[PDB]
Write an enzyme that holds these catalytic residues in place. Structure first.
Site, PDB file in Angstrom:
ATOM      1  N   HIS A  73       0.828  -1.194   0.000  1.00  0.00           N
ATOM      2  CA  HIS A  73       0.000   0.000   0.000  1.00  0.00           C
ATOM      3  C   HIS A  73       0.867   1.251   0.000  1.00  0.00           C
ATOM      4  O   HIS A  73       2.091   1.194   0.148  1.00  0.00           O
ATOM      5  CB  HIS A  73      -0.937   0.018   1.217  1.00  0.00           C
ATOM      6  CG  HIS A  73      -0.228   0.186   2.526  1.00  0.00           C
ATOM      7  ND1 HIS A  73      -0.161   1.395   3.187  1.00  0.00           N
ATOM      8  CD2 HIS A  73       0.442  -0.701   3.299  1.00  0.00           C
ATOM      9  CE1 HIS A  73       0.519   1.244   4.309  1.00  0.00           C
ATOM     10  NE2 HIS A  73       0.898  -0.017   4.401  1.00  0.00           N
TER      11      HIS A  73
ATOM     12  N   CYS B 130       2.305  -5.188   6.467  1.00  0.00           N
ATOM     13  CA  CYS B 130       2.225  -4.872   5.014  1.00  0.00           C
ATOM     14  C   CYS B 130       3.466  -4.113   4.561  1.00  0.00           C
ATOM     15  O   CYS B 130       4.143  -3.508   5.395  1.00  0.00           O
ATOM     16  CB  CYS B 130       0.975  -4.109   4.588  1.00  0.00           C
ATOM     17  SG  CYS B 130      -0.489  -4.600   5.553  1.00  0.00           S
TER      18      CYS B 130
HETATM   19  C1  KSU Z   1      -0.787  -4.514   7.371  1.00  0.00           C
HETATM   20  C2  KSU Z   1      -2.258  -4.596   7.596  1.00  0.00           C
HETATM   21  C3  KSU Z   1      -2.727  -3.136   7.699  1.00  0.00           C
HETATM   22  O1  KSU Z   1      -3.827  -2.723   7.525  1.00  0.00           O
HETATM   23  N1  KSU Z   1      -1.502  -2.317   8.082  1.00  0.00           N
HETATM   24  C4  KSU Z   1      -1.512  -0.936   8.560  1.00  0.00           C
HETATM   25  C5  KSU Z   1      -1.494   0.222   7.551  1.00  0.00           C
HETATM   26  C6  KSU Z   1      -1.502   1.473   7.984  1.00  0.00           C
HETATM   27  C7  KSU Z   1      -1.530   1.760   9.491  1.00  0.00           C
HETATM   28  C8  KSU Z   1      -1.548   0.759  10.359  1.00  0.00           C
HETATM   29  C9  KSU Z   1      -1.537  -0.690   9.861  1.00  0.00           C
HETATM   30  C10 KSU Z   1      -0.292  -3.182   7.883  1.00  0.00           C
HETATM   31  O2  KSU Z   1       0.841  -2.887   8.077  1.00  0.00           O
END
Ligand code: KSU
Length: 352
Positions: free
Chosen positions: A281, A299
């Site tokens: 992302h 992620c």
């Molecule tokens: C993996 C799963 C998710 O939704 N993540 C996240 C993105 C942004 C802020 C907190 C956690 C991951 O790292």
């Protein structure tokens, strides 16, 4: 002298529990078929076709469950006539289950997309389900069934698909007993093709995500992966859904949002590569860490530029491999980590 006609049906008079996975047919001998009719209890005619030679007659539509069918046939010939009447009762399922196949019909997917058949009920006789699924491939390649859970079964070759391969899936589960009275609700048939080889590798030792198209590096993305406490797992990932923007609710994965490791934020250009939550992302808040240190929940944190490029150039079925991380190996039954099971174990299957 002339011989008396003989008739033959694919059903037996007085049969109970006849399966509806095949057509009912009547064939004549020493003569031709002059009349054939098949009806339900209520008397509605069941569609049927007669061969131009008059020898073979078969039903042209599906047959229902919990039906009492009556078949009337008359054969005529130089050696006389013959009339038969038959009645059979079709299967009475204790429950039905509809299959769901992916990828969708007509799609083009990457070299790592496994054929997936998902049922909306638990399957007790997995072998009956494997037997009822026909998988054609061109060029033909060896493959094998393996179940991720009680409801979804997968099929893939030993190694990644060779591009340009046609795949045809025929889930012919209607009229088939899947155990404990579980019968199929319908049949399904999808077809898809394999596209370009797109293997992306993320090396924790270098903290870089490299995307390779047909063996050639095309993009090098600085990334920040799972930190020591919530690390990214090593292994091979399969690419799934793609979102221009997606709300990351931590509760989706059972972790409460009001927790140290929870989260509920909206991110952009997210490409799912794991049922357990691993993504690729856009992460503006970590550009400085991307390419140096890990500061995520799992992620792969990527710049908006690169994340969108990933979104635009990576299709369902492409591979993401993660190596040299401090975490473990992605579970083979995650839903997108199929290739992490050794080929021998996968081939063997777990139909029990
Ligand atoms: C993996 C799963 C998710 O939704 N993540 C996240 C993105 C942004 C802020 C907190 C956690 C991951 O790292």
């Amino acid at each position: 002298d002339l011989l008396v006609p003989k008739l033959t049906a694919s059903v037996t008079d007085g049969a109970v529990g006849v399966t509806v996975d095949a057509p009912v047919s009547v064939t004549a001998a020493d003569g031709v078929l002059a009349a054939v009719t098949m009806v339900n209890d209520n008397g509605r005619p069941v569609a049927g076709r007669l061969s131009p030679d008059g020898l073979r007659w078969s039903t042209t539509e599906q047959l229902g469950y919990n039906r009492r069918y009556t078949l009337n046939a008359t054969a005529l010939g130089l050696g006389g006539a013959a009339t038969r009447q038959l009645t059979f009762q079709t299967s009475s399922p204790a429950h039905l289950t509809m299959p769901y196949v992916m990828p969708g019909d007509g799609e083009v997917v990457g070299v790592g997309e496994p054929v997936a058949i998902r049922f909306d009920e638990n399957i007790a006789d997995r072998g009956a389900a494997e037997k009822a699924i026909k998988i054609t491939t061109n060029p033909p390649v060896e493959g094998a069934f393996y179940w991720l859970n009680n409801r979804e079964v997968r099929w893939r070759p030993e190694h990644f698909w060779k591009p340009g391969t046609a795949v045809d899936v025929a889930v012919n589960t209607y009229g088939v007993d899947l155990g404990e009275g579980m019968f199929g609700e319908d049949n399904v048939q999808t077809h898809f093709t394999i596209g370009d080889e797109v293997i992306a590798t993320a090396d924790d030792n270098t903290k870089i995500l490299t995307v390779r198209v047909n063996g050639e590096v095309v993009k090098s993305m600085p990334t920040s992966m799972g930190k020591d406490s919530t690390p990214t797992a090593n292994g091979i990932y399969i690419v799934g859904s793609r979102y221009k923007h997606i709300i990351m609710d931590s509760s989706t994965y059972g972790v409460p949002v009001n927790s140290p490791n929870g989260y509920r934020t909206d991110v952009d250009w997210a490409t799912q590569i794991s049922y357990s939550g691993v993504f690729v992302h856009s992460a503006p808040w970590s550009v400085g860490a991307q390419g140096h240190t890990n500061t995520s929940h799992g992620c792969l944190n990527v710049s908006p530029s690169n994340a969108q490029w990933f979104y635009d150039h990576v299709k369902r079925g492409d591979i993401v491999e993660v190596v040299n991380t401090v975490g473990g190996t992605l579970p083979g039954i995650d839903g997108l980590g199929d290739w992490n099971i050794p080929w021998d174990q996968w081939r063997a299957g777990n139909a029990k």
